[PDB]
Amino acid sequence: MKGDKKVIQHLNKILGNELIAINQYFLHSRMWNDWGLKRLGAHEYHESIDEMKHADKLIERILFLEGAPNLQDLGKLLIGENTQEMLQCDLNLELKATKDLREAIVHCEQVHDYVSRDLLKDILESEEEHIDYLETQLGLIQKVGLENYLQSHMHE
Amino acid sequence: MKGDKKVIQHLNKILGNELIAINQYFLHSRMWNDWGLKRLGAHEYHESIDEMKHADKLIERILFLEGAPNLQDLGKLLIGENTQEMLQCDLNLELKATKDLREAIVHCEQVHDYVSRDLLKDILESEEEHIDYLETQLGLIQKVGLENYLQSHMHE
Amino acid sequence: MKGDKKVIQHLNKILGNELIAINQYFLHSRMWNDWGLKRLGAHEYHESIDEMKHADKLIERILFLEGAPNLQDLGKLLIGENTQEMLQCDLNLELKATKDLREAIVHCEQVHDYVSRDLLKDILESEEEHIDYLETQLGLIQKVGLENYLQSHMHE
Amino acid sequence: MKGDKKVIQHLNKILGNELIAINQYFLHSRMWNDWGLKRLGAHEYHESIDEMKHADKLIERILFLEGAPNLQDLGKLLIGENTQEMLQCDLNLELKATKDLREAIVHCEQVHDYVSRDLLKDILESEEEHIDYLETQLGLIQKVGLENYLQSHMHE
Amino acid sequence: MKGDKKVIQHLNKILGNELIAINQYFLHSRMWNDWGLKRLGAHEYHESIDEMKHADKLIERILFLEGAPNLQDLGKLLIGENTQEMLQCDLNLELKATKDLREAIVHCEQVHDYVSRDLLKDILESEEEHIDYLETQLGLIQKVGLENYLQSHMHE
Amino acid sequence: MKGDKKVIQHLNKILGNELIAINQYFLHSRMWNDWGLKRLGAHEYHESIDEMKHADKLIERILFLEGAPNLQDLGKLLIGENTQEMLQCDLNLELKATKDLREAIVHCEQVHDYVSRDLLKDILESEEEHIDYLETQLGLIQKVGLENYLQSHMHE
Amino acid sequence: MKGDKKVIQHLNKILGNELIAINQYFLHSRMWNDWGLKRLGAHEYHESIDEMKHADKLIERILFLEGAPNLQDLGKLLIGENTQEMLQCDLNLELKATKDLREAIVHCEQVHDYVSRDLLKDILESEEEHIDYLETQLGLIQKVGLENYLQSHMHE
Ligand code: HEM
Ligand code: HEM
Ligand code: HEM
Ligand SMILES: [As]
Ligand SMILES: [Mg+2]
Ligand SMILES: [Mg+2]
Ligand SMILES: [Mg+2]
Ligand SMILES: [Mg+2]
Ligand SMILES: [Mg+2]
Ligand SMILES: [Mg+2]
Ligand SMILES: [Mg+2]
Ligand SMILES: [Mg+2]
Ligand SMILES: [Mg+2]
């Protein structure tokens, strides 16, 4: 089914966002696991997996719409050097991701690609939940203090 | 069954403290969830549900006694701005609530409405349990420090 | 995550409508139960629980958007005094609730708060279900007569 | 297998009658559901699924005999404005359908297409069961009065 | 609940398309079964059923909005003559159906019927899935050859 | 029960047709098994069994009507050289059987042997299902090519 | 544990080959699914996941050896335009990978990183397995013809 050319370019840019997210989160997860902070390791693993499945849905929809998914161009991964940095790196990436998603939905509505709008909304619902998770972890670092925070995240 | 007009007014006043407590404890619980203090939030939600169950039995009786239950005149919620303050706000609401129950129960006794008294004594017993919980948390903030106390209420 | 001010104002308004509905529907339920019309009491109870869950999710959404939920302001409860009027009251409240949900959806769309839009769309479909129930009961009173209608809501 | 061209004509006629029924009964079922007469909706809904199954078997048989099933020429639906009129419309349709069934069996017998005859006899048997139902609902409306009849069909 | 009269008109037009597809997919399913292409027959059978489900919802919504569902009017079936022709007819039909769905959605948004919108969107997502299936069968016919393609759909 | 002399003679004739088919189908089945076309072997085996069950019920009826079942005079088997001719041989035999079944039924009706007619109708229904099967296989050889057809019938 | 810095440069090279592999195989999978070659898509999906597991174990050995994993530099993805090109692209990549694996292993042996060698020997076995699969599919396309080969990979 021939899709709108700019819809597809939007979808490929979200995909590019999801592809940065997949790898940033995966490496952060394995750093935390590596330092002995398993609870964070595991939680960040699942965030990564989540973006993979978003990427999958985006690849699938591009192909249906007779476009060409772009998995070659990998943007800038924001890699913190401590827990507090890592969390804010992921939050910076999610805030870039959310306005880009918002850009695309406006366009889908213009051209009446409502199915693609809905796909993007469900993705946007999920990135807003990751923002909440992330912000809240920064808050808890202030309320309980970094050392307690890390302590609460050694084990599962 | 025609009731005592003043009992009904005591019952509506107790009902009135219940409705404040429902909205306050509920709002406090979501606040605590929102901040990542999910254990504090789950406890406070069950407190709110409890107050809902008292209101339901109060309403039921008022109607049996051919009064008119008052769900319209909501009073002032005591919303704290941090955890210590939120606990103390629940406490104050409860000290007020218990003084009004003791007064209701005196008048029930005087007019021989012994079933209404038994209801209020049950509720009173539940409010004193609540007070014990709140006083023990404040106690615990002091023994272990606010930071450790908040850490032990992040997860379940 | 900071959200649009007129959005949060819109949510606190929808929330205010829910709180009216919680109290009004709960009291009508206990009223129908008190009169021996257990089937109406059961159904009306479950409407009140529905409004409660909607209010929980608004409250959760307002806090994430860094707003301050308003459980303190409680509008005019519309209590009927017989079955026909309590139903007509519920309906009038629901029609006001859906005019406000539409306007608040319009606004979330303009400002690209698509997740808050989707939440409200969900609540709105719930309210339209409640409107269909309310309207059908009033038609059924006309079809089978009030006495048969009440007979059919005696037993659970 | 090449069948009698005229037998095929009858089968296609019978089919058309069943296509009217499907749509008539479905809409009637859904009108009744919409008025909160859930029991009449449910029964009428099964009458509709019933005619769909007859239609399936007529389409299969037409094809086997190398006919062309005609699902294009939808005849006149008989929609009522109230329960009693809806039932009387169902009764009118069914009585036309059995006159045609008997015509078609007469021709099947004549050309020795005994299988087709048997197919139409089994349909005829269902159609007579449906006549019996409709005549009995109309007779019960008289015996218990419309308001009781409809009360009895409010809930499943 | 009073619906916008031109929403109801669109709903009835979508209903009208659904009624064509029901009859057209069912007849195609029974042709394919009759030719021994039973995997094609079953899959086509379930596309028919799914359209019957969309019709049901559309009739249900129209009656709620005080509309009158049109099941008397049946547009032009596109009956193919062989497997390629039948699939292409189903695709042509689906392309008309998605166009009218977008048009109806634009209008629902305009008059703020966001629930009708959401329903129409769910259907559109289903219609688009049927389009992918059809385009995909047509493409496979080209990759594997018609003889093999049909071979692969003889047995269930 | 002394049955009609000519009814009994028709039943012996239909039995003779069954006896041919039994042997013809059993030999075709074992030829297809012997050539490694096991799915055709199995299917033809079950057609053989079915004609055996028909021959049983005819023998039981003939004996009840005080006749002599003729199992001795075996008509001409139509044995084919390749899959295509075997299916066509089966079909030719099935078309002679249905002709004799129709003439026997006509006679049963004139002399009012209605139970014999009902027996013969059930067999006719089975034979038409076999005619359907056989014609459909000859059509699929045309559609997928002989080599694919046979390929799809090597393994059970 | 301070590990050899050139080993760590190998591992990051092996890792960067896995990262090409993941994306390449995951796009081929989804192209195959989008063409209806669902058995090819599923098989290539699992090759993708397999490489993702390889990528995970290398990141972990690197972090433990005190190096910094590189997920930022995405190699050249070899994306075919038909099934046969797709498989040769996979094979092209896998021979580049095995070359790099053997280099890296010889170096591990020099410095006595026997444990990183054993991890590399395990990955090398996986890739040789995948080379066999890919060669065998190319050789099967010659033996059975492309139309049969794709036909056999339509369904799962
Ligand atoms: C750094 C690169 C990647 C790493 C390290 C990685 C790692 C993993 C791991 C460990 C799993 C779990 C496999 C299992 O044991 O079940 C997984 C699953 C998965 N991956 Fe990846 N992956 C990467 C890239 C990608 C990409 C680029 C995509 C899509 C474009 C993707 C899509 C998926 C999907 C759909 C799953 C299945 C998730 C589920 O349903 O559980 N991955 N990945
Ligand atoms: C801001 C106001 C309120 C909020 C947010 C609220 C919310 C809730 C929620 C989320 C539940 C759990 C329902 C479920 O998931 O099954 C609940 C249950 C319940 N509510 Fe409320 N509610 C409110 C006011 C009230 C009032 C005023 C009453 C009674 C007069 C009431 C009576 C009840 C009862 C009896 C239950 C069931 C408890 C049980 O037996 O498990 N609620 N409410
Ligand atoms: C007004 C148009 C129609 C409507 C609204 C409609 C609706 C429905 C619904 C809701 C179902 C049940 C689906 C499920 O939940 O599984 C159904 C089943 C079915 N329909 Fe229809 N349908 C229509 C036309 C037709 C026609 C024209 C035919 C055949 C020529 C047909 C054949 C069938 C069959 C065979 C079934 C399955 C019955 C069973 O459960 O065994 N339908 N229909
Ligand atoms: As083949
Ligand atoms: Mg496609
Ligand atoms: Mg009373
Ligand atoms: Mg104490
Ligand atoms: Mg927050
Ligand atoms: Mg045929
Ligand atoms: Mg209505
Ligand atoms: Mg005897
Ligand atoms: Mg270390
Ligand atoms: Mg080899």
PDB file of all heavy atoms in Angstrom, chain G residues 4 7 16 18 32 45-46 50 63 125 128 138 144 151:
ATOM      1  N   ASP G   4      44.735  -7.450  28.195  1.00  0.00           N
ATOM      2  CA  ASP G   4      45.515  -6.969  27.062  1.00  0.00           C
ATOM      3  C   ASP G   4      44.710  -5.993  26.216  1.00  0.00           C
ATOM      4  O   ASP G   4      43.550  -6.255  25.892  1.00  0.00           O
ATOM      5  CB  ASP G   4      45.929  -8.168  26.229  1.00  0.00           C
ATOM      6  CG  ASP G   4      46.760  -7.792  25.035  1.00  0.00           C
ATOM      7  OD1 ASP G   4      46.226  -7.155  24.090  1.00  0.00           O
ATOM      8  OD2 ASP G   4      47.947  -8.173  25.047  1.00  0.00           O
ATOM      9  N   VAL G   7      43.717  -7.562  22.443  1.00  0.00           N
ATOM     10  CA  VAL G   7      42.551  -8.420  22.667  1.00  0.00           C
ATOM     11  C   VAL G   7      41.291  -7.572  22.703  1.00  0.00           C
ATOM     12  O   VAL G   7      40.314  -7.823  21.985  1.00  0.00           O
ATOM     13  CB  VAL G   7      42.683  -9.189  23.985  1.00  0.00           C
ATOM     14  CG1 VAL G   7      41.381  -9.878  24.339  1.00  0.00           C
ATOM     15  CG2 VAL G   7      43.792 -10.187  23.899  1.00  0.00           C
ATOM     16  N   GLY G  16      31.683  -5.366  16.642  1.00  0.00           N
ATOM     17  CA  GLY G  16      31.165  -4.558  15.550  1.00  0.00           C
ATOM     18  C   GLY G  16      30.693  -5.381  14.360  1.00  0.00           C
ATOM     19  O   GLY G  16      29.807  -4.953  13.608  1.00  0.00           O
ATOM     20  N   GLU G  18      29.245  -8.427  14.875  1.00  0.00           N
ATOM     21  CA  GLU G  18      27.939  -8.850  15.381  1.00  0.00           C
ATOM     22  C   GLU G  18      26.896  -7.756  15.174  1.00  0.00           C
ATOM     23  O   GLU G  18      25.740  -8.041  14.834  1.00  0.00           O
ATOM     24  CB  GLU G  18      28.043  -9.257  16.859  1.00  0.00           C
ATOM     25  CG  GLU G  18      29.025 -10.432  17.118  1.00  0.00           C
ATOM     26  CD  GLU G  18      28.573 -11.803  16.536  1.00  0.00           C
ATOM     27  OE1 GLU G  18      27.487 -11.910  15.926  1.00  0.00           O
ATOM     28  OE2 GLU G  18      29.308 -12.799  16.700  1.00  0.00           O
ATOM     29  N   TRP G  32      11.538 -10.612   4.359  1.00  0.00           N
ATOM     30  CA  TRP G  32      10.955 -11.895   4.006  1.00  0.00           C
ATOM     31  C   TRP G  32       9.524 -12.008   4.535  1.00  0.00           C
ATOM     32  O   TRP G  32       8.612 -12.411   3.790  1.00  0.00           O
ATOM     33  CB  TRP G  32      11.876 -13.013   4.505  1.00  0.00           C
ATOM     34  CG  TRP G  32      12.969 -13.352   3.479  1.00  0.00           C
ATOM     35  CD1 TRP G  32      12.819 -13.392   2.120  1.00  0.00           C
ATOM     36  CD2 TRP G  32      14.345 -13.684   3.732  1.00  0.00           C
ATOM     37  NE1 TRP G  32      13.995 -13.742   1.520  1.00  0.00           N
ATOM     38  CE2 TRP G  32      14.946 -13.947   2.480  1.00  0.00           C
ATOM     39  CE3 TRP G  32      15.115 -13.801   4.882  1.00  0.00           C
ATOM     40  CZ2 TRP G  32      16.287 -14.288   2.352  1.00  0.00           C
ATOM     41  CZ3 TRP G  32      16.433 -14.159   4.765  1.00  0.00           C
ATOM     42  CH2 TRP G  32      17.012 -14.397   3.506  1.00  0.00           C
ATOM     43  N   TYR G  45      15.071 -14.317  11.636  1.00  0.00           N
ATOM     44  CA  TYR G  45      14.827 -13.722  12.941  1.00  0.00           C
ATOM     45  C   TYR G  45      15.691 -14.390  14.000  1.00  0.00           C
ATOM     46  O   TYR G  45      16.361 -13.717  14.789  1.00  0.00           O
ATOM     47  CB  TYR G  45      13.341 -13.821  13.287  1.00  0.00           C
ATOM     48  CG  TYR G  45      12.993 -13.312  14.681  1.00  0.00           C
ATOM     49  CD1 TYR G  45      12.967 -11.953  14.966  1.00  0.00           C
ATOM     50  CD2 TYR G  45      12.682 -14.193  15.693  1.00  0.00           C
ATOM     51  CE1 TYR G  45      12.652 -11.504  16.203  1.00  0.00           C
ATOM     52  CE2 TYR G  45      12.368 -13.747  16.947  1.00  0.00           C
ATOM     53  CZ  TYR G  45      12.357 -12.403  17.194  1.00  0.00           C
ATOM     54  OH  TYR G  45      12.044 -11.970  18.445  1.00  0.00           O
ATOM     55  N   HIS G  46      15.722 -15.717  14.011  1.00  0.00           N
ATOM     56  CA  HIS G  46      16.479 -16.396  15.050  1.00  0.00           C
ATOM     57  C   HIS G  46      17.970 -16.211  14.858  1.00  0.00           C
ATOM     58  O   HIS G  46      18.699 -16.124  15.850  1.00  0.00           O
ATOM     59  CB  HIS G  46      16.092 -17.875  15.112  1.00  0.00           C
ATOM     60  CG  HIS G  46      14.734 -18.084  15.707  1.00  0.00           C
ATOM     61  ND1 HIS G  46      13.650 -18.512  14.968  1.00  0.00           N
ATOM     62  CD2 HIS G  46      14.265 -17.845  16.959  1.00  0.00           C
ATOM     63  CE1 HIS G  46      12.579 -18.548  15.741  1.00  0.00           C
ATOM     64  NE2 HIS G  46      12.926 -18.148  16.954  1.00  0.00           N
ATOM     65  N   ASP G  50      20.356 -14.686  17.697  1.00  0.00           N
ATOM     66  CA  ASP G  50      21.580 -15.412  18.016  1.00  0.00           C
ATOM     67  C   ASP G  50      22.771 -14.461  18.070  1.00  0.00           C
ATOM     68  O   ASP G  50      23.583 -14.508  19.008  1.00  0.00           O
ATOM     69  CB  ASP G  50      21.802 -16.508  16.965  1.00  0.00           C
ATOM     70  CG  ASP G  50      22.442 -17.749  17.527  1.00  0.00           C
ATOM     71  OD1 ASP G  50      21.678 -18.616  17.991  1.00  0.00           O
ATOM     72  OD2 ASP G  50      23.695 -17.875  17.480  1.00  0.00           O
ATOM     73  N   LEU G  63      33.813  -5.265  29.246  1.00  0.00           N
ATOM     74  CA  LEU G  63      33.648  -4.521  30.500  1.00  0.00           C
ATOM     75  C   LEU G  63      34.416  -5.151  31.657  1.00  0.00           C
ATOM     76  O   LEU G  63      34.992  -4.448  32.488  1.00  0.00           O
ATOM     77  CB  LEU G  63      32.168  -4.434  30.838  1.00  0.00           C
ATOM     78  CG  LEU G  63      31.392  -3.448  29.974  1.00  0.00           C
ATOM     79  CD1 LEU G  63      29.907  -3.534  30.260  1.00  0.00           C
ATOM     80  CD2 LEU G  63      31.861  -2.040  30.237  1.00  0.00           C
ATOM     81  N   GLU G 125      32.082 -21.305  16.192  1.00  0.00           N
ATOM     82  CA  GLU G 125      31.250 -22.462  15.882  1.00  0.00           C
ATOM     83  C   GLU G 125      29.854 -22.028  15.437  1.00  0.00           C
ATOM     84  O   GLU G 125      29.335 -22.531  14.439  1.00  0.00           O
ATOM     85  CB  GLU G 125      31.199 -23.405  17.087  1.00  0.00           C
ATOM     86  CG  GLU G 125      30.310 -24.607  16.894  1.00  0.00           C
ATOM     87  CD  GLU G 125      30.820 -25.854  17.595  1.00  0.00           C
ATOM     88  OE1 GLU G 125      31.460 -25.755  18.684  1.00  0.00           O
ATOM     89  OE2 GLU G 125      30.572 -26.949  17.029  1.00  0.00           O
ATOM     90  N   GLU G 128      30.106 -20.704  11.791  1.00  0.00           N
ATOM     91  CA  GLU G 128      30.302 -21.789  10.840  1.00  0.00           C
ATOM     92  C   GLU G 128      28.998 -22.538  10.618  1.00  0.00           C
ATOM     93  O   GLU G 128      28.667 -22.911   9.474  1.00  0.00           O
ATOM     94  CB  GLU G 128      31.422 -22.730  11.312  1.00  0.00           C
ATOM     95  CG  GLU G 128      32.816 -22.304  10.793  1.00  0.00           C
ATOM     96  CD  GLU G 128      33.990 -23.207  11.194  1.00  0.00           C
ATOM     97  OE1 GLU G 128      33.870 -24.454  11.164  1.00  0.00           O
ATOM     98  OE2 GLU G 128      35.069 -22.653  11.510  1.00  0.00           O
ATOM     99  N   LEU G 138      21.566 -21.855  -0.647  1.00  0.00           N
ATOM    100  CA  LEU G 138      21.929 -21.523  -2.018  1.00  0.00           C
ATOM    101  C   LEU G 138      21.970 -22.782  -2.888  1.00  0.00           C
ATOM    102  O   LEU G 138      21.420 -22.806  -3.998  1.00  0.00           O
ATOM    103  CB  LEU G 138      23.263 -20.782  -2.029  1.00  0.00           C
ATOM    104  CG  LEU G 138      23.198 -19.387  -1.405  1.00  0.00           C
ATOM    105  CD1 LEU G 138      24.594 -18.885  -1.175  1.00  0.00           C
ATOM    106  CD2 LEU G 138      22.413 -18.388  -2.265  1.00  0.00           C
ATOM    107  N   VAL G 144      16.142 -27.531  -6.513  1.00  0.00           N
ATOM    108  CA  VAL G 144      14.679 -27.592  -6.609  1.00  0.00           C
ATOM    109  C   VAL G 144      14.082 -26.460  -7.417  1.00  0.00           C
ATOM    110  O   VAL G 144      12.858 -26.472  -7.663  1.00  0.00           O
ATOM    111  CB  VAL G 144      14.006 -27.636  -5.217  1.00  0.00           C
ATOM    112  CG1 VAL G 144      14.666 -28.652  -4.321  1.00  0.00           C
ATOM    113  CG2 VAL G 144      14.024 -26.269  -4.515  1.00  0.00           C
ATOM    114  N   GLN G 151       8.342 -21.323  -2.449  1.00  0.00           N
ATOM    115  CA  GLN G 151       7.086 -21.967  -2.065  1.00  0.00           C
ATOM    116  C   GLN G 151       7.226 -22.681  -0.740  1.00  0.00           C
ATOM    117  O   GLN G 151       6.345 -22.591   0.122  1.00  0.00           O
ATOM    118  CB  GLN G 151       6.635 -22.984  -3.116  1.00  0.00           C
ATOM    119  CG  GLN G 151       5.276 -23.652  -2.800  1.00  0.00           C
ATOM    120  CD  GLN G 151       4.970 -24.851  -3.713  1.00  0.00           C
ATOM    121  OE1 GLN G 151       5.886 -25.551  -4.147  1.00  0.00           O
ATOM    122  NE2 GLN G 151       3.683 -25.093  -3.987  1.00  0.00           N
TER     123      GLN G 151
END
